[PDB]
């Protein structure tokens, strides 16, 4: 029904190693070459990758910006409203980014902002200019 355990034997494979006198050693050569031609390709890309790693040496350590820890207030200082209007100009609807920039307003206050001051900071215009980029 099935070959012995760990003996391998396809109908297809048999017809292959018989179809002529040396189809035998022919086929074990195409593999012997297909093999070495990959073992080599490995080293090529192990070498490529080894050098691309030596560029990433040092990490991003000299570029990392210390931890800002600040209490989410609820008042909109004029300064903050101004930061806001510009964060919109630059970021569109990304409420997280705006919130990050302003520093001390949570992702929702920001959404609410969009609705209160909508009239007086022409947030329509501002948003429609952000799109044009």
């Amino acid at each position: 029904r099935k070959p012995p355990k760990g003996m391998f034997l396809s109908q297809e494979d048999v017809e292959a190693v018989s179809a002529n006198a040396t189809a035998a050693t022919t086929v074990l050569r195409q593999l012997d070459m297909e093999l070495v031609s990959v073992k080599r390709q490995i080293q090529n890309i192990k070498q490529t990758n080894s050098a691309l790693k030596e560029k990433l040496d040092g990490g991003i350590e000299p570029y990392r910006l210390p931890e800002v820890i600040q209490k989410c207030n609820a008042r909109w200082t004029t300064e903050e409203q101004l930061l806001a209007v510009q964060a919109i100009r630059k970021y569109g609807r990304d409420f997280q980014a705006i919130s990050d920039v302003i520093g001390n307003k949570s992702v929702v206050q920001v959404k609410n902002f969009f609705v209160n001051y909508r009239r007086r900071f022409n947030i329509d215009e501002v948003l429609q200019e952000w799109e044009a980029e």
Binding site: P3, P4, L9, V17, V27, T48, K55, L83, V101
Partner: protein, 666 residues
């Protein structure tokens, strides 16, 4: 098994069914009702038991009925019929028994039997026992043919048959109770010893053997499932198949390596693409930090757009630091997932050079079993006789097997040194023309009703013929003779003054250096009381070694042995002999095999007798005149003593039935 059912089994018969041969002489019973069948079977078995229990004395119709019960000793035509069948076909009272009723005084019919091998002897005994006139014609100056036994001083070793292959269903079992052969069991254990002269260690010994075994099954699967039996018209041999399998095993090893590295690259290149992304981010980062730094250095107070700039760039920078942190994450995974794959490779090779060599010894062992190059055996059929193996441990005939032919020969008309040259057979009888092997111009003629031919297949094969058939054998028979295989295997007998091997070890292998010579002295037997070693020559090697001088052979022989035991534990041999069966003109080989393109069926053709054409045209169809026995004639037990012995019984039966007529068939 045992009881009366043991007897059925120990006689090679199904205890609870009627055989085709029984259906033949009891068509009344077998086409009858199940009830009668059981009575018959019982009678049969019970009789067998009786004979078996005590085969040193004849078992008569009386003495049988004498020992039966109701409802069985009820019908006595039945009992008499049964006993008479069993007797005719040598199931009971065969071999060497004490007769109760000294021999019926005048004989009927006359038979010439060519050759006093065991097959011939066993047949003669039966026919004489059936009161017929029998004479055997032996070319050699001794009985026993391929049962040869070297004797000198206390040295005793067979150059021919040597082992009893299990007593479980073996006619020979009976014979050994009639004849004091000394039967010693053989311990299976066989330590191999590489070319260098040192043990293959348990670790390897086991892996190779086990692979060998798997390799065989593999061919079998290949044959029955994949049906790989013809290859551009020629029948596939076992040898061929073995290669095709090894080839495929080699292939898959490669196949496997290939897709393992194929897995490394696909991953070690997902990694590249990630590192590329990672550089380019570290790039944007470097420059963004600069931008932010320059925007922080504008000391305040600042207007809001310049304050926003600091803020903007600050977020923008942490955003790109989140990313190049999740990528260094990913990077770590793919980098370990790669010490992974790269640490557990698949295997380097299917089999090493030391391996392929040890596997070769296992092939030699098989070439020995079959007396032939695996490239000659039939794929589909080489093992057709496998089912009918006896059960029990193999044995050696410690006092030399010759003791059997000699026992059988006793009482018989045997003309030794008489070489048959022509067999002519006609509607009214046969004459056989033989010569004297010593002065070969000195001629003999034998007249007879029947000729039983037990000539070895090797002989029957000769071109051109050593024995002429007149008229020629029908083509259906000669094709059988061609198609069948007749191989070769040889022995070297080493006689020393002292044991220097392991007394408790019966056989030990030597591993050759090449495929080409796996057979050469590949195996040694410690079997006898005396200090004697036996060395096999099998496979392709056997044939070639026959052209080498005895000394050179005993050369390579001692060489190997020193190699294994120490260059000075191994003395010169006191007496040596070397067999050459392919050379021997009264053998022309050693025993038969199922060659590629043959089948078990050819063996049946061998046994089929020959019936001549009519004398005067339009005269009635004649009686069959020419009959065959021999190891090559018995489908289920080729190549053996017991198998020949059996073919002898067979023919004697069939001959008597024909010539003395069968009273029991009614």
């Amino acid at each position: 098994p045992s009881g009366v059912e043991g007897a059925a089994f120990q006689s090679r018969l199904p205890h609870d069914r009627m055989t085709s041969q029984e259906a033949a002489c009891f068509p009344d019973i077998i086409s009858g009702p199940q009830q009668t069948q059981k009575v018959f079977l019982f009678i049969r078995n019970r009789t067998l038991q009786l004979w078996l229990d005590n085969p040193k004395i004849q078992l008569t119709f009386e003495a049988t009925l004498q020992q039966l019960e109701a409802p069985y000793n009820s019908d006595t035509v039945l009992v008499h019929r049964v006993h008479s069948y069993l007797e005719r076909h040598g199931l009971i009272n065969f071999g060497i028994y004490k007769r109760i009723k000294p021999l019926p005084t005048k004989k009927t019919g006359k038979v010439i039997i060519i050759g006093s091998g065991v097959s011939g002897l066993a047949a003669a005994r039966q026919l004489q026992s059936f009161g017929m006139d029998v004479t055997l014609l032996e070319a050699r100056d001794r009985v026993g043919g391929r049962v040869a036994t070297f004797r000198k001083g206390n040295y005793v070793a067979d150059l021919g048959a040597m082992v009893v292959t299990g007593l479980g269903g073996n006619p020979m079992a009976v014979v050994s109770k009639q004849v004091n052969m000394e039967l010693a069991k053989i311990k299976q254990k066989c330590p191999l010893y590489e070319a260098n002269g040192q043990a293959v260690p348990k670790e390897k010994d086991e892996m190779v053997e086990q692979e060998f075994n798997r390799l065989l099954e593999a061919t079998s699967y290949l044959s029955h499932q994949l049906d790989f039996n013809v290859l551009n018209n020629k029948p596939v041999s076992l040898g061929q198949a073995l290669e095709v399998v090894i080839q495929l095993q080699e292939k898959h090893v490669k196949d496997e390596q290939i897709e393992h590295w194929k897995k490394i690259v696909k991953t070690q290149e997902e990694l590249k693409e990630l590192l590329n992304k990672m550089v380019n981010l570290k790039e944007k980062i470097k420059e963004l930090h600069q931008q932010y730094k320059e925007a922080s250095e504008v000391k305040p107070p600042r207007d809001i757009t310049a304050e926003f700039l600091v803020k903007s760039k600050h977020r923008d920078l942490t955003a790109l630091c989140k990313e190049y942190d999740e990528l260094a994450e990913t990077q770590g995974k793919l980098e370990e997932k790669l010490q992974e794959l790269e640490a557990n490779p698949p295997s380097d090779v299917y089999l090493s050079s030391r391996d392929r060599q040890i596997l070769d010894w296992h092939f030699a062992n098989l070439e020995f079993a079959n007396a032939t190059p695996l490239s000659t055996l039939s794929l589909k059929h080489w093992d057709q006789d496998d089912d009918f193996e006896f059960t029990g441990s193999h044995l050696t005939v410690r006092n030399g097997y010759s003791c059997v032919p000699v026992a059988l020969a006793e009482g018989l008309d045997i003309k030794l040194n008489t070489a048959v040259r022509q067999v002519r057979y006609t509607a009214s009888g046969c004459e056989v023309i033989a010569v004297n092997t010593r002065s070969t111009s000195q001629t003999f003629i034998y007249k007879c009703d029947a000729v039983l031919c037990t000539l070895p297949l090797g002989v029957l094969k000769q071109q051109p013929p050593a024995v002429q058939f007149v008229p020629p054998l029908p083509e259906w028979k000669t094709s059988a003779v061609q198609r069948m295989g007749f191989g070769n295997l040889n022995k070297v007998v080493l006689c020393f003054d002292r044991v220097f091997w392991d007394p408790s070890v019966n056989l030990f292998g030597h591993v050759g250096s090449t495929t080409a010579s796996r057979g050469e002295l590949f195996l040694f037997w410690n079997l006898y009381k005396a200090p004697i070693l036996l060395a096999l020559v099998a496979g392709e090697a056997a044939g070639i070694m026959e052209n080498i001088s005895d000394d050179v052979i005993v050369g390579r022989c001692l060489a190997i042995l020193k190699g294994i035991f120490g260059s000075s534990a191994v003395p010169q041999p006191k007496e040596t002999v070397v067999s050459r069966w392919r050379a021997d003109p009264w053998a022309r080989g050693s025993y038969s095999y199922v060659a590629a393109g043959s089948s078990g069926n050819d063996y049946d053709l061998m046994a089929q007798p020959i019936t001549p054409g009519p004398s005067i045209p339009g005269a009635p169809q004649p009686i069959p005149r020419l009959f065959f026995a021999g190891e090559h004639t018995i489908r289920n037990y080729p190549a053996t003593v017991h198998g020949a012995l059996l073919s002898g019984l067979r023919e004697a039966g069939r001959i008597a039935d024909q010539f003395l007529g069968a009273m029991y068939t009614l």
